[PDB]
Each structure stands twice: as C-alpha cells, then as structure tokens.
C-alpha cells in the first residue's frame, strides 16, 4: 500500500505499461534530485521525440503550465497523474516534485502502473527523527542509510543531537569537530540535501554555559563552523541540565540573538529550534513562569520542543492545547519512542500508536527519538513518517506490517514473528509500557488458570503454545542467517539467541506438563535447567552496557507463562513423588541463606546484589543474611541503604561510612562469604 497515504487518490483499474518509448518534458528545469530518480526508473527505455509524454516540473516551469490548477497550493505538495496518453509529476515546489517521484516509485510494479490521479501534501510541516538519546551514537554508515530512508518516506527533518557526542554537548561544545568527524558531517549534509532532508545540527551547551559575551560568541563561532560544513538548520537544547543554564530569560535572549545576528544575516537558513528545560507537563513548575516566559520572549519564528504530559508519553488533544496556550505557538513534538536508553536490555519493535490523529494543525513538527539500534528503529520511523504526513488516514497495524515488509522483504514474516514478542519495555521509572504478545495472551491465560487450579486445560490452547514456540525457533534461525540487511541482523542477534532459547525452554516445559513417566520428566527438567544457564550466559556476556546490561525478550506474556508453568509442574512433581526438585526460574550461580530473604540475587556486570524489597522488614535477635559466591574474588566495595570470609567460619569485620548511604572498600581482600547481623539496597562489587 502507498506510504505515507496520499491526501487524495483516485484509481481507475486500468493499468498501463511504463513506456518503452517516451518523450521527457522538463528534465532540464525540474528538481535535479527528482529527475535523477525518474531516469533510474526509466533506464533501458528510449528517450525520443515521439512516444508517451512524461512531464515533470514545479509550478512555474514551462513543462507543467497545463497542470497548474491541479497542483496543491501547499508546501511540499504535488500532483501526480498516470493515464493512457501521459504521465504528470508536478510539484508545488522543488521538494514536492521529489515527493511526487517517491510516490511514483511505489506505483510501478512489474513495469506496470495503475491509471491514477493523486493530490498530496503533508499535514504536519516538519516530520522526522531526532538522534537525541543517551548511549552509543549512530555510526556514520547507519546515518547514511537513515537519510535515504527518510527521503523515501517523505520525512524532511533529521536533528543531530546525540547526548554522548562531546562536540555536541559537555565538555567540548565550544570546539570545532576534528578533521575526520567534520568530513563525515559534511558528507551527511550532502546526502541529506540529495534526499530532501534538512540536517538540523543541535548544540547542548547548558550544563556549563556562562551568560557572558565570551560563551555567546563561541556558540556563534561553532554555528559558523557548522555553516561552513553545509549545515543550514540549527538547534539549541537546554534539556537535562541544572544551574544557570535553566534560566528562561537568558535562553530566549540567546535564541533571539542567534536569530537576529545569524539566521537573519545568512541567505539560506531554514529551521531554528530550541528544546526547553521543562519539556513535559509533569516536570513544569506550577508556581512558575518558565514556559510563559519562553512563550512571551522567544521570537515567533523559533520552534519549541515538547515531549507531552510526561517524559515518555503519547500526544493528546488536551495535552497539546495545554502547552500551546503557554508557549504561544504550535509545539514541535519530540516523541520518546522507540528510544530505549532507559530500558537498554529491551528492543522496542512494536507498532507506533497512542497519538491523537486529529491534531495536525496544533503541531509545528513531529519527530521520533529512536533506539541506539538504527536499522531496528526503522519500523517505528517508517510509521511516524506515515502518521505525520497523513494522520487522518493513519492505520497503526497496517503501517507496522508495511514497514517490516520494506525493511526485510526476504524474511518479513519471520521479522514480524520476532517483533510481536519484542515490544514491551518491562517495568521502568517512567511508567511507560507497550502491548506485546497479544494474539497468544488469551490461550496463555486460560491454560495457566486451569493448570494452577485443578481443571483440565483445553487441548487447543496447549497446541497454540506449542505452535508458537515452534514458530519462534523458525524465525530465530532464519533471521540469524539473513544477509539482505546485515546491519539489522547484527543489531538484533543477541536478542535472537535469547528468543530461541526462550522458545526451546517453552517446548521442554510443555513436555514436562504432558509428563509421561518419572524419568522422562527428569530428563526434561535437566534440559530446562541447562537452558536456564545458557540464558544467563547470554545475559552476562551480551549487550554489556553501563545502564541496563543484558538481553531480555518476550517478557510480557511468554516468559512469565513459561516460568509459572515450570514452577507449578515442579511443585506437583515434588508432591507426587515426595521429591525436592528446585523450582527456581532464573539461574543464579551464587547462593543467599537468611532468617528474615526470598529476594532473588542478581548479577549486573561485576556487581552481585539482593533485589530491592517492598514489605518493609522485620529484623531482631542476632538474625543474619549470608551470601556465598561461587568462588573467591577480590572485593572492590560494598554499598547498603536502609563481616567477610573466604572460608565460611573465619570472619573479619568491615566498618561502613555514613551519608544517610553506608559503604566500605575492601581493597582487593579475598571474599567468598558476606554476612550482616542487626546494629546501629545491598550491592557487593568485585573484580571481573
Ligand atoms: C547510563 C546512562 C547514560 O549513558 N548516561 C546518562 N543517562 C541518563 O539517563 C538515561 C535515560 C542521564 C540523565 C540525566 C543526566 C545525565 C544522564 N546520563
Ligand atoms: C526535549 C526532550 N529532551 C529529552 N531529553 C532526554 C533524551 O535525551 C532521552 O533520550 C529521553 C529518554 O531517556 O529523555 C529526555 S527527553
Ligand atoms: Ca523548476
């Protein structure tokens, strides 16, 4: 299906052959980036004075004079027509002609075109991506590929602002990029121009900015150096900072100075954008004038960014009305999905949904903050492009599938099968969740309800679970060997391994449920235990980032089903045969006995810890919490917030410091046991 869907479309159910012999009118006067696409689509066909007429141009060109009343009078609009006698590709402006050609390219199938007439233009003026996350910035190659992808989906905006780029942010925002990075940025700009994308270079100076002449001038000089590299759009971000940089008068004055002294002196600057310090409703001070001050003081052509009612949120009619009244202009949305920089152990490959589809006139722009996995983010980015171009016709589910089919034609079903179970974020501090595994959830819930209570589970439900696990393994194995988009596969691989293991575990657990004899059960139980260990090894060796290390997959429905089923069936087996099989679901090589306590230990990088508790705690009469590691290690430190040994019996005390935060270095002392008993979090850090 055409993506994004045109504003107006009339199809005739004739079809016509892309002309073998054609006559091209407007090649020397239309957008050269449009003419280039057209000639690629027409190579091997004969350009000659006789034959089918193709007319390409912008309003004002000689080539499309006949069609000027058909051309929408909208920025980035176009008119496209195909019939028996002629083809017309006509923009309101140069970018419109390029976009005509991106629609044309999707219409052409097996050298044939439908007889069609289209009038199209975007509902939202600025549409795109802000690489504005924390973590590993996108590679240069990833970015080249992104920019072509934006062009094909009529996204006109790429805002460059990776938080970990030292020349964008703290500390080196005052310095020009080194030669190597500068030549790369220059190449990005050329490629963005060829795909009709505005490269917006942002700067994040607010953590140590001084409100003086010197820093003002250095900021302009940096902007000037970026102008030399080809940049024609600019932004200044004041997000996630404290101190003097948060002053709204000074922010507005700086932005206004940049406008008057730089954006108004150059012949050719397009966007000028700021992001505020209070960038969502729940974070704006009620007893405060931060947003009204920006609203009143900031020059009216300067955009202001906004994430919604919370840091992570979907955009509502009431929410956008709320911010527009204060900032006095339509908000430029920074939408925090599929960004995963706060749940880095998850991929977010689900559909794009939750945003009101009737508020196009209430937003200046709409951009998505994506994951650090660039190719993976294309599912959401394609969807956002469709949303923001034509929100009234926005179909979440269909666009999700179209995206998957574009990104991985050779294995789209397998990719969809993986993504359906890799959508949710798990629990997080922002409270933001997404649907996952919704097709199997019914059967999952019934099966488990029965099985726990005492009744027979429905056999179709059991088979649906089997079906699922089988299909999961097919998709994992096919995906891992796919070479049509190697960069995608490299990104998702650790999660593909973990997903396969989840599926294998699921199958073995269902064979425990069918429970032929005693020794079959035990073989299956041992196989599960080994798969649990394998999952632990992936979780400790893959994606070892400093925030949320490891790899979690199918967490919403599938892993809890499997874990709860295993626990249940192991309990029934213990009851039946008077045995003592361990029913725990996650492999943990360290042990933790106590009197108080059913908190599972966790391993994160070189940290061994107890899971933070809830039921506030009963502790008296020499009661102890003993942790035994699986070997002796050099101890770095311990940290606790409301004794050691290698031996078991031979103990030495440690004295904790105090800041409300108890903590003591162990200066590489050998440690295997750690014990605590009543006096005056819980994290041992070791050398790995
Ligand atoms: C481990 C996180 C990282 O790479 N850096 C970082 N992250 C965050 O939040 C990530 C969600 C952050 C917030 C405020 C200030 C600095 C920060 N640094
Ligand atoms: C104008 C909004 N700016 C924001 N800055 C931060 C981003 O860099 C993070 O990626 C995001 C989610 O962790 O949270 C905030 S939203
Ligand atoms: Ca022209």
XYZ file of C-alpha atoms and ligand atoms in Angstrom:
723
model
C 0.000 0.000 0.000
C 1.247 3.596 -0.684
C 3.145 5.026 2.340
C 2.552 7.630 3.557
C -1.016 7.509 2.138
C -1.842 10.439 -0.155
C -4.321 13.127 0.847
C -6.358 12.454 -2.266
C -6.293 9.408 -4.509
C -8.494 8.241 -7.426
C -7.725 4.824 -9.003
C -9.254 3.538 -12.252
C -8.469 -0.220 -12.520
C -6.917 0.153 -15.952
C -3.143 -0.325 -15.852
C -0.527 0.878 -18.347
C 2.948 -0.213 -19.305
C 5.772 2.108 -18.283
C 6.554 3.442 -21.762
C 9.148 1.542 -23.829
C 9.432 4.732 -25.862
C 8.823 8.067 -24.068
C 9.233 11.801 -24.517
C 10.519 13.703 -21.445
C 9.426 17.270 -20.843
C 11.068 19.272 -18.012
C 14.299 17.302 -17.364
C 16.386 20.497 -17.514
C 14.016 22.580 -15.355
C 12.636 20.314 -12.572
C 14.303 19.450 -9.237
C 17.520 17.610 -10.252
C 17.085 15.156 -7.341
C 13.636 14.312 -8.801
C 14.951 13.974 -12.364
C 17.662 11.578 -11.156
C 15.047 9.233 -9.576
C 12.991 9.370 -12.793
C 15.923 8.451 -15.063
C 16.815 5.476 -12.816
C 13.202 4.316 -13.110
C 13.335 4.787 -16.933
C 16.820 3.380 -17.757
C 16.766 0.903 -20.671
C 13.710 2.676 -22.203
C 14.063 5.005 -25.212
C 14.091 8.779 -24.826
C 12.901 10.115 -28.184
C 10.792 12.923 -29.634
C 7.925 10.546 -30.462
C 6.104 8.448 -27.873
C 4.442 8.783 -24.491
C 4.721 12.200 -22.811
C 6.137 12.466 -19.314
C 6.015 15.919 -17.789
C 7.967 16.803 -14.674
C 8.363 20.226 -13.119
C 7.435 22.618 -10.315
C 4.624 25.187 -10.594
C 6.129 27.998 -12.756
C 8.073 25.643 -15.041
C 7.078 25.549 -18.702
C 6.755 21.804 -18.554
C 3.720 21.779 -16.254
C 1.857 25.011 -17.290
C -1.086 22.949 -18.464
C -1.496 21.396 -14.995
C -1.122 24.398 -12.705
C -4.717 24.278 -11.380
C -4.229 20.621 -10.356
C -1.162 21.339 -8.210
C -1.995 21.699 -4.490
C -1.088 25.061 -3.065
C 0.637 23.622 -0.026
C 4.303 23.469 0.916
C 5.700 20.134 -0.342
C 2.538 19.460 -2.327
C 2.284 17.697 -5.664
C 0.019 16.444 -8.384
C 0.630 13.080 -9.935
C -1.276 11.570 -12.845
C -0.980 8.435 -14.976
C -3.301 7.574 -17.890
C -3.075 6.047 -21.390
C -1.761 9.184 -23.031
C 0.512 10.789 -20.412
C 2.321 10.906 -17.083
C 2.475 14.121 -14.967
C 4.755 14.644 -11.946
C 4.259 18.198 -10.737
C 5.337 19.842 -7.500
C 4.150 22.968 -5.870
C 7.818 23.477 -5.079
C 11.027 21.531 -5.650
C 10.634 19.200 -2.705
C 7.082 18.474 -3.860
C 8.417 17.183 -7.177
C 10.834 14.871 -5.366
C 7.949 13.566 -3.283
C 5.867 13.026 -6.399
C 8.632 10.722 -7.584
C 8.676 8.792 -4.291
C 5.009 8.048 -4.762
C 5.582 7.214 -8.462
C 8.284 4.648 -7.487
C 5.828 2.714 -5.233
C 3.161 2.663 -8.009
C 5.495 0.998 -10.530
C 5.186 -2.832 -10.235
C 6.436 -5.324 -12.917
C 6.929 -2.488 -15.421
C 3.254 -1.514 -14.991
C 1.424 1.396 -13.359
C -2.130 1.857 -12.367
C -4.206 4.554 -14.073
C -4.354 7.060 -11.194
C -4.685 10.643 -10.156
C -3.272 11.993 -6.869
C -3.140 15.266 -4.986
C -0.960 15.171 -1.922
C 0.837 17.243 0.666
C 1.789 16.867 4.334
C -0.478 17.692 7.288
C 2.454 18.422 9.597
C 5.150 20.859 8.303
C 8.234 19.232 9.945
C 8.451 15.421 10.049
C 11.379 13.297 11.108
C 13.919 11.944 13.563
C 15.948 13.410 16.400
C 19.020 11.299 17.256
C 18.793 12.765 20.756
C 19.335 9.725 23.012
C 21.991 8.706 25.605
C 24.358 5.866 24.629
C 26.367 4.806 21.593
C 25.677 7.331 18.840
C 24.720 6.005 15.458
C 27.619 5.016 13.173
C 28.403 7.047 10.100
C 27.187 4.139 7.911
C 23.958 3.817 9.903
C 23.327 7.545 9.297
C 23.925 7.363 5.542
C 21.320 4.637 5.354
C 18.885 6.553 7.574
C 18.964 9.628 5.309
C 17.996 7.713 2.194
C 15.209 6.025 4.155
C 13.868 9.466 5.185
C 13.717 10.644 1.656
C 11.735 7.611 0.507
C 9.131 8.182 3.256
C 8.978 11.959 2.857
C 10.500 12.778 6.232
C 12.055 16.254 5.813
C 13.926 16.537 9.140
C 16.985 14.947 10.798
C 18.030 16.619 14.035
C 21.572 15.633 15.092
C 21.977 15.697 18.885
C 23.497 12.516 20.421
C 23.946 13.167 24.138
C 27.331 11.353 24.228
C 28.886 13.393 21.384
C 31.475 15.617 23.205
C 31.380 18.266 20.348
C 27.565 18.480 20.642
C 27.450 18.581 24.457
C 29.676 18.740 27.606
C 32.570 19.330 27.564
C 33.727 20.255 24.021
C 30.700 22.050 22.523
C 32.886 25.154 22.085
C 35.331 23.350 19.796
C 35.099 22.630 16.099
C 34.812 18.953 15.149
C 38.212 17.368 14.279
C 39.044 16.845 10.576
C 37.708 13.295 10.385
C 34.357 13.954 12.039
C 33.967 17.201 10.079
C 34.461 15.469 6.722
C 31.814 12.894 7.823
C 29.358 15.635 8.818
C 29.944 17.335 5.505
C 29.119 14.055 3.704
C 25.949 13.647 5.815
C 24.865 17.098 4.775
C 25.379 16.436 1.069
C 23.406 13.152 1.294
C 20.633 14.842 3.341
C 20.332 17.555 0.632
C 20.122 14.903 -2.109
C 17.217 13.220 -0.255
C 15.445 16.471 0.560
C 16.160 16.271 4.304
C 17.006 19.296 6.479
C 20.067 18.380 8.527
C 19.455 20.267 11.790
C 22.673 20.380 13.868
C 21.889 20.869 17.572
C 24.143 22.051 20.400
C 23.665 21.233 24.092
C 25.692 23.883 25.912
C 23.641 24.389 29.054
C 25.441 22.487 31.829
C 28.426 24.931 31.964
C 27.279 27.900 29.820
C 28.129 31.314 31.266
C 25.721 34.149 30.438
C 28.521 36.400 29.149
C 29.936 37.725 25.876
C 32.616 35.064 25.614
C 30.316 31.934 25.544
C 27.701 33.714 23.356
C 30.436 34.392 20.787
C 31.902 30.889 20.978
C 28.428 29.401 20.398
C 28.021 31.602 17.264
C 31.518 30.689 16.095
C 30.654 26.974 16.419
C 27.475 27.607 14.461
C 29.557 29.425 11.878
C 31.942 26.466 11.548
C 28.922 24.142 11.100
C 27.583 26.564 8.470
C 30.929 26.076 6.626
C 30.317 22.315 6.530
C 26.986 22.851 4.763
C 24.556 22.933 7.736
C 21.502 25.157 7.069
C 19.316 24.394 10.132
C 20.258 24.726 13.830
C 19.006 23.955 17.318
C 19.952 24.706 20.907
C 18.904 22.198 23.522
C 18.538 23.040 27.261
C 17.258 19.557 28.369
C 18.505 17.522 31.397
C 20.688 20.239 32.956
C 20.841 22.138 36.257
C 22.099 25.541 37.402
C 22.333 28.801 35.486
C 21.632 27.318 32.060
C 17.986 26.697 33.127
C 17.161 30.459 33.175
C 14.323 31.067 30.709
C 15.039 34.783 30.055
C 18.639 34.028 29.143
C 17.653 31.093 26.958
C 15.176 33.235 24.996
C 17.698 36.060 24.658
C 20.374 33.754 23.344
C 17.967 32.210 20.808
C 16.767 35.673 19.762
C 20.379 36.800 19.359
C 21.160 33.829 17.130
C 18.086 34.640 15.058
C 18.903 38.331 14.554
C 22.656 38.053 14.206
C 22.959 34.715 12.258
C 19.689 33.215 10.968
C 18.575 36.664 9.633
C 22.018 37.542 8.115
C 22.554 34.338 6.081
C 20.692 33.941 2.816
C 19.518 30.392 3.417
C 18.806 29.193 6.948
C 15.607 27.037 7.343
C 14.815 25.756 10.848
C 15.812 27.308 14.123
C 14.638 25.222 17.079
C 15.059 25.135 20.853
C 14.297 22.498 23.449
C 13.340 23.725 26.867
C 14.469 22.587 30.285
C 10.881 21.965 31.357
C 9.969 19.851 28.344
C 6.943 17.973 29.715
C 3.892 18.861 31.821
C 4.638 16.792 34.959
C 8.099 18.383 35.082
C 6.940 22.009 34.665
C 6.783 24.010 37.877
C 3.132 25.057 38.630
C 4.382 28.026 40.796
C 6.490 29.011 37.866
C 6.661 31.119 34.796
C 9.304 29.173 32.906
C 7.098 28.279 29.964
C 5.174 31.555 29.749
C 8.485 33.435 29.859
C 9.800 31.418 26.887
C 6.421 31.827 25.177
C 6.406 35.608 25.537
C 10.120 36.347 24.915
C 11.118 33.858 22.192
C 10.839 35.295 18.649
C 7.695 33.808 16.956
C 9.608 32.008 14.135
C 11.641 29.952 16.714
C 10.261 26.449 17.443
C 9.888 24.988 20.901
C 10.090 21.241 21.520
C 7.863 19.245 23.827
C 7.530 15.543 24.840
C 3.883 15.563 26.117
C 2.385 15.245 29.602
C 5.370 13.187 30.810
C 8.971 12.481 29.736
C 7.662 9.459 27.867
C 4.109 9.944 26.610
C 1.706 9.914 23.774
C 0.332 13.180 22.405
C -3.331 14.081 23.220
C -5.657 16.950 22.213
C -5.760 18.222 25.834
C -2.016 17.907 26.225
C -1.126 19.857 23.088
C -3.750 22.542 23.932
C -2.174 22.832 27.382
C 1.331 23.565 26.071
C 0.242 25.712 23.047
C -1.573 28.207 25.373
C 1.663 28.758 27.307
C 4.347 28.893 24.570
C 2.003 30.846 22.220
C 2.683 28.703 19.184
C 2.142 25.151 17.961
C 4.529 22.802 19.827
C 7.250 20.887 17.885
C 6.866 17.349 19.297
C 9.841 15.262 20.437
C 8.211 11.861 20.822
C 10.117 9.447 23.064
C 9.554 6.181 21.206
C 11.173 3.861 20.274
C 14.042 5.301 22.374
C 15.273 2.585 24.788
C 18.157 4.414 26.546
C 16.438 3.745 29.940
C 15.499 0.059 29.210
C 18.617 -0.859 27.213
C 18.134 -4.603 27.709
C 14.908 -4.422 25.550
C 14.285 -3.895 21.926
C 11.099 -1.930 21.049
C 9.994 -3.266 17.686
C 6.211 -2.845 18.155
C 3.798 -0.542 16.282
C 3.523 3.201 16.650
C 0.298 4.168 18.363
C -1.293 6.391 21.048
C -1.018 9.774 19.321
C -4.231 11.664 18.504
C -4.813 11.731 14.750
C -6.916 14.938 14.593
C -4.343 17.479 15.938
C -2.127 18.082 12.881
C -2.894 21.869 12.939
C -1.822 22.033 16.619
C 1.816 20.868 15.952
C 4.640 22.580 14.043
C 6.617 19.369 13.792
C 6.793 15.782 14.939
C 9.999 13.838 15.429
C 10.780 10.475 16.960
C 13.747 9.872 19.337
C 14.808 6.356 18.303
C 16.844 3.426 19.834
C 20.625 3.306 19.529
C 19.885 0.334 17.123
C 19.469 2.337 13.899
C 18.088 -0.283 11.496
C 15.767 -1.607 14.194
C 14.271 1.876 14.643
C 13.183 1.925 11.016
C 9.963 0.073 11.920
C 8.860 2.984 14.139
C 10.414 5.656 11.892
C 8.511 4.438 8.827
C 5.348 4.509 10.975
C 5.965 8.029 12.229
C 6.513 9.197 8.624
C 3.103 7.752 7.665
C 1.465 9.273 10.829
C 2.859 12.758 10.392
C 2.285 13.046 6.633
C -1.360 11.849 6.781
C -2.613 11.373 10.350
C -6.313 11.226 9.447
C -5.665 8.079 7.426
C -3.105 6.657 9.964
C -3.506 2.838 10.321
C -1.102 1.566 13.003
C -1.294 -2.149 12.287
C -1.102 -1.991 8.530
C 1.777 0.515 8.649
C 3.702 -1.700 11.078
C 3.432 -4.621 8.632
C 4.266 -2.442 5.592
C 7.356 -1.235 7.442
C 8.535 -4.781 8.234
C 7.916 -5.794 4.617
C 10.039 -2.846 3.410
C 12.905 -3.303 5.797
C 13.240 -7.104 5.296
C 11.388 -8.342 2.172
C 13.186 -11.735 2.208
C 12.025 -12.678 5.712
C 9.212 -10.317 6.667
C 7.039 -12.965 8.327
C 9.976 -14.095 10.491
C 10.764 -10.488 11.413
C 7.114 -9.823 12.312
C 7.093 -13.005 14.391
C 10.153 -11.726 16.324
C 8.846 -8.187 16.710
C 5.389 -9.245 18.012
C 7.162 -10.550 21.158
C 9.727 -7.696 21.462
C 7.554 -4.691 22.042
C 7.131 -4.028 25.733
C 9.635 -2.139 27.900
C 9.220 -4.093 31.106
C 8.760 -2.109 34.362
C 10.629 1.208 34.374
C 10.871 4.501 36.209
C 8.843 6.341 33.516
C 5.876 4.028 33.847
C 5.658 3.624 30.063
C 4.529 0.352 28.617
C 3.553 -1.139 25.288
C 1.435 -4.125 24.263
C 3.183 -7.421 23.487
C 2.205 -10.960 22.539
C -1.479 -10.054 22.356
C -2.544 -12.903 19.929
C -1.393 -15.699 22.290
C -2.314 -13.979 25.510
C -5.860 -15.451 25.653
C -4.732 -19.050 25.263
C -1.844 -18.393 27.666
C -4.184 -17.053 30.390
C -6.717 -19.913 30.092
C -4.055 -22.598 30.091
C -2.459 -21.215 33.217
C -5.729 -20.505 35.041
C -6.782 -24.122 34.643
C -3.390 -25.683 35.341
C -2.756 -23.894 38.600
C -6.286 -24.522 39.976
C -7.008 -28.249 39.261
C -9.036 -28.448 35.995
C -8.034 -29.797 32.595
C -6.556 -27.232 30.207
C -8.073 -27.053 26.743
C -6.006 -29.088 24.243
C -6.278 -26.383 21.519
C -4.643 -23.909 23.952
C -1.729 -26.294 24.571
C -1.254 -26.723 20.830
C -1.418 -22.924 20.347
C 1.505 -22.647 22.798
C 3.391 -25.413 21.003
C 2.651 -23.742 17.644
C 4.033 -20.538 18.992
C 7.313 -21.937 20.333
C 7.906 -23.836 17.082
C 7.336 -20.677 15.048
C 9.633 -18.672 17.318
C 12.529 -21.075 16.589
C 11.928 -20.943 12.837
C 12.063 -17.159 12.908
C 15.213 -17.055 15.096
C 17.177 -19.348 12.842
C 16.060 -17.757 9.611
C 16.747 -14.261 10.940
C 20.284 -15.107 12.140
C 21.263 -16.297 8.665
C 19.602 -13.483 6.743
C 22.027 -11.440 4.639
C 19.611 -8.989 2.921
C 20.106 -6.440 5.758
C 23.213 -7.496 7.631
C 23.296 -4.392 9.804
C 19.804 -5.146 11.168
C 20.752 -8.704 11.996
C 23.954 -7.653 13.753
C 21.860 -5.286 15.987
C 19.217 -7.872 16.964
C 21.410 -11.020 17.157
C 21.861 -11.197 20.971
C 18.066 -10.970 21.319
C 17.532 -13.518 18.518
C 19.693 -16.036 20.540
C 17.787 -15.342 23.734
C 14.395 -15.648 21.961
C 15.374 -19.023 20.501
C 16.316 -20.199 23.980
C 13.027 -18.948 25.406
C 11.201 -20.979 22.733
C 13.298 -24.109 23.428
C 12.633 -23.771 27.142
C 8.900 -23.360 26.426
C 8.751 -26.595 24.432
C 10.565 -28.565 27.192
C 8.317 -27.141 29.874
C 5.194 -28.272 27.901
C 6.714 -31.745 27.666
C 7.031 -31.690 31.467
C 3.280 -30.877 31.584
C 2.408 -33.931 29.400
C 4.517 -35.893 31.904
C 4.718 -39.430 30.538
C 6.799 -41.199 33.236
C 9.180 -40.191 36.031
C 12.474 -40.438 34.218
C 11.179 -38.587 31.073
C 10.152 -35.741 33.358
C 13.557 -35.653 34.943
C 15.371 -35.583 31.599
C 13.166 -32.590 30.576
C 13.745 -30.887 33.933
C 17.512 -31.188 33.499
C 17.304 -29.852 29.995
C 15.361 -26.845 31.299
C 17.996 -26.217 33.978
C 20.714 -26.151 31.281
C 18.747 -23.822 29.018
C 18.309 -21.528 32.097
C 22.076 -21.444 32.441
C 22.500 -20.681 28.744
C 20.113 -17.739 29.046
C 22.192 -16.470 31.979
C 25.387 -16.671 29.951
C 23.868 -14.546 27.126
C 22.561 -12.117 29.763
C 26.076 -11.643 31.205
C 28.126 -11.584 28.032
C 25.881 -9.728 25.551
C 24.988 -6.082 25.393
C 27.062 -5.309 28.467
C 26.218 -1.567 28.534
C 26.679 0.530 31.651
C 22.948 1.197 32.281
C 20.804 -1.970 31.862
C 23.179 -4.728 30.765
C 21.945 -7.904 29.178
C 19.249 -9.203 26.958
C 15.539 -9.607 27.739
C 12.953 -10.842 25.285
C 9.304 -11.881 25.248
C 8.952 -10.564 28.756
C 5.314 -9.504 28.907
C 3.467 -12.806 28.387
C 5.730 -15.625 27.124
C 8.475 -15.731 29.787
C 6.057 -15.394 32.722
C 3.886 -18.213 31.280
C 6.907 -20.495 30.984
C 8.313 -19.607 34.377
C 4.965 -20.057 36.140
C 4.233 -23.326 34.362
C 7.687 -24.751 35.324
C 7.294 -23.694 38.966
C 3.825 -25.285 39.046
C 4.702 -28.582 37.393
C 7.840 -28.991 39.602
C 5.729 -28.458 42.702
C 3.187 -31.111 41.580
C 6.079 -33.499 40.951
C 7.537 -32.912 44.394
C 4.120 -33.510 45.975
C 3.512 -36.653 43.916
C 6.883 -38.438 44.245
C 7.962 -36.900 47.542
C 10.974 -35.234 45.840
C 12.826 -31.915 46.340
C 13.495 -30.523 42.814
C 14.468 -26.852 42.759
C 11.585 -24.769 41.276
C 13.515 -21.524 40.645
C 13.191 -19.949 37.248
C 16.362 -17.840 36.736
C 19.818 -19.403 37.003
C 21.949 -17.798 39.711
C 25.430 -19.254 40.469
C 25.675 -17.530 43.885
C 23.538 -18.535 46.977
C 21.870 -16.465 49.769
C 20.575 -18.109 53.008
C 18.864 -15.949 55.703
C 16.425 -15.937 58.716
C 14.469 -12.768 57.770
C 15.140 -13.136 52.146
C 13.219 -14.720 49.272
C 14.672 -11.877 47.282
C 16.457 -13.332 44.245
C 20.115 -12.289 43.917
C 21.051 -10.504 40.717
C 24.294 -10.253 38.799
C 24.944 -6.998 36.900
C 28.403 -6.579 35.333
C 30.830 -7.026 38.306
C 28.048 -6.304 40.892
C 26.318 -9.077 42.930
C 23.188 -7.733 44.659
C 19.980 -8.515 46.525
C 16.740 -7.442 44.758
C 15.326 -4.274 46.414
C 12.475 -5.282 48.866
C 8.913 -3.907 49.486
C 7.285 -5.325 52.649
C 9.371 -3.128 55.000
C 11.460 -5.517 57.081
C 11.443 -7.437 60.444
C 14.952 -7.935 61.894
C 15.928 -8.787 65.514
C 17.752 -11.223 67.873
C 21.092 -11.810 66.012
C 19.374 -12.603 62.669
C 21.696 -12.867 59.640
C 21.761 -12.509 55.806
C 24.595 -14.740 54.341
C 25.698 -14.535 50.648
C 28.062 -17.183 49.314
C 29.615 -16.555 45.869
C 30.584 -19.434 43.558
C 34.323 -18.735 44.029
C 36.728 -16.373 45.847
C 37.124 -12.924 44.202
C 38.973 -9.689 45.012
C 36.446 -7.342 46.663
C 36.175 -3.735 45.437
C 33.426 -2.470 47.754
C 30.025 -2.997 49.406
C 27.110 -0.486 49.418
C 23.961 -0.774 51.589
C 20.976 1.600 52.055
C 18.140 1.253 54.615
C 31.640 -9.336 58.095
C 33.535 -11.191 55.266
C 35.172 -14.571 54.748
C 36.690 -16.883 52.097
C 36.254 -19.795 54.461
C 32.740 -19.894 55.928
C 33.955 -19.857 59.555
C 36.920 -17.407 59.549
C 35.396 -13.851 59.717
C 36.738 -10.256 59.635
C 34.621 -7.119 60.226
C 34.322 -4.062 57.923
C 33.388 -0.543 59.116
C 30.893 1.308 56.914
C 30.981 5.116 56.279
C 27.683 7.080 56.524
C 25.732 9.632 54.417
C 22.068 8.890 55.437
C 24.303 5.505 52.080
C 26.527 3.047 54.015
C 29.652 1.887 52.096
C 33.149 0.340 52.543
C 36.005 -0.509 50.109
C 37.569 -3.949 50.628
C 40.860 -3.031 48.887
C 41.033 -6.330 46.932
C 40.553 -8.560 50.011
C 39.653 -12.140 49.016
C 35.904 -12.666 49.538
C 33.516 -15.596 49.115
C 31.020 -15.102 52.010
C 29.391 -11.849 53.145
C 27.291 -11.657 56.395
C 25.276 -8.910 58.154
C 23.521 -9.058 61.608
C 21.478 -6.207 63.412
C 23.291 -2.952 64.541
C 23.119 0.981 64.531
C 19.891 -1.693 48.522
C 22.608 -4.351 49.091
C 25.442 -4.486 46.477
C 28.803 -6.277 46.558
C 31.157 -5.093 43.777
C 34.034 -7.485 42.840
C 36.872 -7.616 40.313
C 35.888 -9.230 36.965
C 23.724 5.002 31.633
C 23.050 6.257 31.084
C 23.927 7.105 30.172
O 24.508 6.648 29.189
N 24.004 8.419 30.507
C 23.056 9.272 31.068
N 21.796 8.775 31.054
C 20.819 9.486 31.541
O 19.554 8.975 31.507
C 19.395 7.912 30.543
C 17.956 7.530 30.474
C 21.035 10.818 32.079
C 20.040 11.647 32.612
C 20.371 12.883 33.093
C 21.702 13.342 33.053
C 22.696 12.557 32.544
C 22.388 11.274 32.042
N 23.412 10.495 31.527
C 13.148 17.842 24.735
C 13.188 16.429 25.280
N 14.537 16.055 25.678
C 14.798 14.917 26.315
N 15.986 14.629 26.656
C 16.189 13.300 27.177
C 16.554 12.419 25.994
O 17.890 12.733 25.596
C 16.394 10.974 26.398
O 16.769 10.132 25.311
C 14.937 10.762 26.772
C 14.564 9.348 27.179
O 15.545 8.741 28.018
O 14.557 11.621 27.861
C 14.783 13.007 27.722
S 13.585 13.794 26.676
Ca 11.933 24.307 -11.652
